[PDB]
Design a protein around this ligand. Structure first.
Ligand SMILES: Cc1cc2nc3c(=O)[nH]c(=O)nc-3n(C[C@H](O)[C@H](O)[C@H](O)COP(=O)(O)OP(=O)(O)OC[C@H]3O[C@@H](n4cnc5c(N)ncnc54)[C@H](O)[C@@H]3O)c2cc1C
Ligand SMILES: [Zn+2]
Ligand SMILES: [Zn+2]
Ligand SMILES: [Zn+2]
Lengths: 12, 740
């Protein structure tokens, strides 16, 4: 879920 | 000949197994034993040492049971003899720190490796010659082999990790630390706590992130080693964010028995470079000399032109420069900063003409940068009295009541939107006004004139946040970014101003002021960048960080042109706008009535005055100097466009005299009135989603063109639109993409 993931480590 | 000289493990390359434990008086040493136990291709222990701990009647069983208990009570992996051996008995390995030697050495079994020993070790060193010349053990070079780790039985577990104090709520072996182990800035909370709700820029210490899996797929099967090292690295960065974290700094903090330590040390470097490139460490206002670049030379062979020297452009430039990449920034104006512009000529006070508030300090790069600079922020008090024209302080229950109703109106909007598409989007303002009248009519509750005026104040707060009257903003998408984890914690006034951060980011960079870009040509081998006076620049890559309004106006000619898809996204966002007034007084006239609150509200007399100085801010939290700042938002920006600065001042002073009706108000001795809307290179305050638009537009604008033209700025950050923080992170994001 994108409600959690680190912005800088979700760029792919 | 009774016993074996072969390892139990099929495919093992150890032609001669020796026992590392020598714990039993009966140890087989290098001779024949019943069974050779395999910890790694270079590490085995004999059957009797196995038994010395394993069987109840043997003397090492006492130690095994006490360890098994501790392991079992705060661990998740099996407490096997191989696990006991690897955690408690395997000898340590340490690398000689003599630059021309650099050989790995096994320590004698009684020696407990510490950071200090690892930091200074050289061959031969003992607590009680020609040691460096003696050959390196052959098992060392073996660790490099691709298969070595696959032939290693259990994953390494780190001891006394710098991360441990922050992970006390996890089981150590789930985070790659040993179960047998027994004043950081309060805004640094880089690790999720178990089953804690979402917050910005947080990692799970027990789960690899998408980009991590992508770069290190070899770890998807077993992430223990990666996680331990990543968490260690982060914990080290946050414990000392004022210097660059290097492999040399990390290595003494990697404490684990066995040859596996060699594997760990060999991995920490790649992991560190990854976290650097991505912007998790070695970031903020850290600046590094030519001899100290943050990424190896293989990243260095490129050139970048960054257009705009606001938070986004400077963040990217700072990152790329620090990496060792060649960077030139082109700025249109005679100053850097963009929508960061501070006035420091107010006696003993810094007042921002643009940004000055930090919304959510926990894990906020701005808070990291304040730590690095040793500057303090002021956390806002909760108290904000709503003062009526002229004098009456509004009953807090009326304030709270109308706030409740305003949020209720928003709640029903979020019900209405659930089955609507972009083609069906209505203005938020229209939808609110509609639901309000429907609620007024159904239950015949009439609100007093004051209650209606207080609702109007709350409405103006949302227009303030959006940078627009709500009739231009999307009912579907106004709060789209709330889908993503947001910054937790304090909302603060950045008393010294964002300019302090901006100036530090910029120091030592190649920045060309008064160089407004007019043309970007990316049809050839290198990007051709032309300024409005015809000056030519070129690089392999170009990053555009100009404000949304400037993209919407087409101020820069792109060859080839931007795609229709990009143009549609660009035009689907709103160029929001607020303006500020700051006033210096000879004395703090408001102290008697305001009583030290950070701000006070101004109840609008009528709908036509909504957003006209809705909130005044006391700009000295030390309560010594006399500076007020106020905002012009929503429809009030329009009413102000054809007024000169003197006239805006007059209306503000008229407002204040009404608000403090029962007292004299001195004349201001100094003031400014901002004109962001008509600043040719800015033309806005911050973005919002216009009716018919989607949060996806931020992603679409952010999308690079042919790995050649890159985009950053607050209007390219879907998670964190509008803010200096979001603009800063968009720059860090693009620097990562560009460096790859
Ligand atoms: C009055 C006001 C109050 C605000 N309050 C806050 C606040 O309290 N907290 C907060 O977090 N944010 C606040 N913001 C928003 C915040 O300042 C912006 O989101 C942020 O500065 C955006 O950064 P940026 O790098 O994206 O854009 P910018 O800051 O706008 O910088 C872009 C740069 O691009 C340059 N440029 C434009 N065109 C060209 C060209 N053709 N060639 C070369 N250069 C060009 C411009 O001159 C500018 O310097 C406020 C903004 C305003 C105006
Ligand atoms: Zn073996
Ligand atoms: Zn033995
Ligand atoms: Zn040596």
């Amino acid at each position: 879920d994108p409600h959690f993931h680190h912005f800088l480590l979700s760029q792919t | 000949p009774l016993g074996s000289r072969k390892c139990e493990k099929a495919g093992c390359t150890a032609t001669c197994p020796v026992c590392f434990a020598s714990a039993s008086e009966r140890c087989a040493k290098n001779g024949y034993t019943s069974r050779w136990y395999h910890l790694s291709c270079g590490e085995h222990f004999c059957n009797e040492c196995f038994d010395h701990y394993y069987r109840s009647h043997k003397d090492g069983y006492d130690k095994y049971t006490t360890w098994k208990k501790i392991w079992t009570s705060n661990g998740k992996t099996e407490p096997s003899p191989k696990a006991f051996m690897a955690d408690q008995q395997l000898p340590y390995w340490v690398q000689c720190t003599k630059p021309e030697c650099r050989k790995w050495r096994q320590l004698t079994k009684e020696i407990q490796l510490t950071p200090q020993i690892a930091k200074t070790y050289r061959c031969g060193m003992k607590p009680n010659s020609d040691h460096c010349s003696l050959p390196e053990d052959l098992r060392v070079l073996e660790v490099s082999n691709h298969w070595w780790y696959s032939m290693l039985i259990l994953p390494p577990l780190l001891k006394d990790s710098v991360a441990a104090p922050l992970l006390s709520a996890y089981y150590p072996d789930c985070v790659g630390m040993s179960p047998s182990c027994t004043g950081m800035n309060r805004y640094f909370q880089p690790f999720y706590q178990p089953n804690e709700c979402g917050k910005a820029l947080c990692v799970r210490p027990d789960v690899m992130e998408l980009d991590e899996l992508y770069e290190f797929p070899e770890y998807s099967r077993d992430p223990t080693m990666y996680l331990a090292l990543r968490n260690l690295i982060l914990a080290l960065w946050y414990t000392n964010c004022k210097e660059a974290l290097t492999p040399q700094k990390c290595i003494p903090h990697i404490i684990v028995r066995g040859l596996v330590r060699i594997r760990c040390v060999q991995e920490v470097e790649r992991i560190l470079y990854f976290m650097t490139r991505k912007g998790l460490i070695n970031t903020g206002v850290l600046s590094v000399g030519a001899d100290q670049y943050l990424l190896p030379k293989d990243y260095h062979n490129k050139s970048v032109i960054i257009i705009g020297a606001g938070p986004a452009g400077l963040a990217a430039a700072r990152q790329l420069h620090n990496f060792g990449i060649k960077v030139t920034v082109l700025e249109a104006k005679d100053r850097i900063g963009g929508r960061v512009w501070d006035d420091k000529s107010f006696k003993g006070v810094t007042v921002g003409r643009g940004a000055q508030i930090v919304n959510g300090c926990i894990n906020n790069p701005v808070a990291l940068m304040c730590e690095q600079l040793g500057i303090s922020m002021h956390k806002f008090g909760e108290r904000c009295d709503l003062i009526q024209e002229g004098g009456r302080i509004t009953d807090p229950t009326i304030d709270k009541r109308m706030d409740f109703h305003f949020n209720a109106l928003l709640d029903v909007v979020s019900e209405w939107r659930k089955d609507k598409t972009q083609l069906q989007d209505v203005p938020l303002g229209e939808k609110i006004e509609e639901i309000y009248k429907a609620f007024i009519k159904e239950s015949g509750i009439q609100f007093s004139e004051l209650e209606g005026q207080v609702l109007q104040f709350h409405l103006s707060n949302l227009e303030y946040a959006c940078g627009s009257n709500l009739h231009q903003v999307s009912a579907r998408s106004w709060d789209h970014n709330e889908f993503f984890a947001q910054f937790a914690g304090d909302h603060t006034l950045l008393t010294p101003g964002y300019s302090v951060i901006i100036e530090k980011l910029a120091e030592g960079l190649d920045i060309q002021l008064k160089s407004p870009v007019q043309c970007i040509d990316y049809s050839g081998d290198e990007v051709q960048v032309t300024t409005t006076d015809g000056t030519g620049y070129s690089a392999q890559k170009v990053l555009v960080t100009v404000p949304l309004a400037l993209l919407q106006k087409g101020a820069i000619q792109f060859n080839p042109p931007l795609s229709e898809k990009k143009m549609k996204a660009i035009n689907s966002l709103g160029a929001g706008i607020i303006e500020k007034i700051a006033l210096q007084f000879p004395y703090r006239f408001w102290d008697s009535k305001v009583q030290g609150a950070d701000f006070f509200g101004h109840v609008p007399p009528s709908a036509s005055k909504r957003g006209l100085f809705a909130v005044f801010y006391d700009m000295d939290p030390q309560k010594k100097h006399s500076v007020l700042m106020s905002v012009i938002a929503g429809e009030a920006v329009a009413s102000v466009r054809t007024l000169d600065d003197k006239q805006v001042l007059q209306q503000c002073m008229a407002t204040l005299r009404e608000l403090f009706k029962e007292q004299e108000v001195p004349d201001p001795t100094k003031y400014f009135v901002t004109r962001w809307s008509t600043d040719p290179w800015i033309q806005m305050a911050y973005s919002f989603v216009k009716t018919g638009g989607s949060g996806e537009a931020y992603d679409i604008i952010a999308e690079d063109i042919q790995g050649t033209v890159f985009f950053a700025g607050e209007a390219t950050n879907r998670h964190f639109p509008q803010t200096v923080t979001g603009a800063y992170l968009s720059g860090v994001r693009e620097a990562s993409k560009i460096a790859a």
